[PDB]
Amino acid sequence: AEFMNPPPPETSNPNKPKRQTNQLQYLLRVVLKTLWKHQFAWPFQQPVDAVKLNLPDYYKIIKTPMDMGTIKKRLENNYYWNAQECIQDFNTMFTNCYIYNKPGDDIVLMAEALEKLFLQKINELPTEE
Numbered sequence: 001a002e003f004m005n006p007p008p009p010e011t012s013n014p015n016k017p018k019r020q021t022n023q024l025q026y027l028l029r030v031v032l033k034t035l036w037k038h039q040f041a042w043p044f045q046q047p048v049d050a051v052k053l054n055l056p057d058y059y060k061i062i063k064t065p066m067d068m069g070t071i072k073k074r075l076e077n078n079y080y081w082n083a084q085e086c087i088q089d090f091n092t093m094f095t096n097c098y099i100y101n102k103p104g105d106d107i108v109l110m111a112e113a114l115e116k117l118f119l120q121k122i123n124e125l126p127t128e129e
């Protein structure tokens with residue numbers, strides 16, 4: 001933990017209500033699994049370290065950070081109540097990339113590849129049972 005980076009998003013909290021659903025299960029076993037192993041996943045596998053990357057303004061611009069390392073912890077810890085909360089995390093991660101970086105930057109193309117997979121899988125999100 002460098003003190004000039006924020007604390008990561010919460011991945012545990014006993015006061016937050018929690019539930020398993022078939023949809024959250026799919027999000028872990030199918031969606032995360034698929035995206036995590038992708039060739040271009042590695043920048044999204046942990047919070048942005050703005051100190052190491054020499055991007056002092058990152059957390060001035062990006063006020064709601066998210067990454068797949070956090071999402072994986074949230075899924076594995078059953079932090080979520082529903083699939084929408086998890087899907088919103090993924091959407092936040094993509095949008096933060098697209099807001100902070102120039103169109104056609106490598107990092108943007110990488111995010112775009114992951115988001116394309118994501119959309120395919122979320123289109124097949126099972127009916128809640």
Ligand SMILES: CCNC(=O)[C@H](C)NC(=O)Cn1cc(-c2c(C)noc2C)cn1
Pocket residue numbers: 042043044046047048049052053055096097100101107
């Ligand atoms: C703590 C370990 N961390 C790394 O291994 C290093 C520090 N990360 C990288 O080199 C690659 N990276 C680029 C970004 C990024 C994203 C996402 N959106 O905009 C930017 C800019 C995030 N990670």
